[PDB]
Symmetry: C2
Subunit: 111 residues, 2 copies
Amino acid sequence: TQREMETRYRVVLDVSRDPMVLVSMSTGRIVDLNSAAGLLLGGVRQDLLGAAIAQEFEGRRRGEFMETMTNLAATPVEVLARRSQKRLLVVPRVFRAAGERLLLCQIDPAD
Amino acid sequence: TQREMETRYRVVLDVSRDPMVLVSMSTGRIVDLNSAAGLLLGGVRQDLLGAAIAQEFEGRRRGEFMETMTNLAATPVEVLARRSQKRLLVVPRVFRAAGERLLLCQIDPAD
């Protein structure tokens, strides 16, 4: 049933056409995402897992970027993805999972 | 970490704007869904959990409906939701979770 929840998560995340990136609050790094998000970011899953999310967006740095997100998730950010050169909108939500916080980020084309 | 996977699943499913319904292969009943799916079906979560999915669609019966889905998921169905009176398209995918099969169904407006 541990195996079942992981599987249900994996399937729901990968099938959903809603572009989503999962970010560690602790490290500002991507822990998971779906291919719809990969497509808007312009990167494959393998290159984006473990990546610092702020560094995918031109002009952004981890400190400022994570504070911006955390602040918004308390109430969209306008960004430009380096790999795809697409202008995007990012809407963050914060949730607690096993003593740890994650940012689930929804991504939408801005233009 | 069992608690973490459930939470990650719950969040990813509820946040995703992609309308999804989770159906038990064993009983043909809904085990989970998001509010986007609820909206197209025309029902609240509380009334749809545990419901036989075929009975939400005018003219469909569980036997035939589940076989149709299972068959398609091997390679969209056109349905009419009773509560919302909306014409929909349903695209099923099958996956194994803890000795059991689930149909993840994606729902889209047909008209």
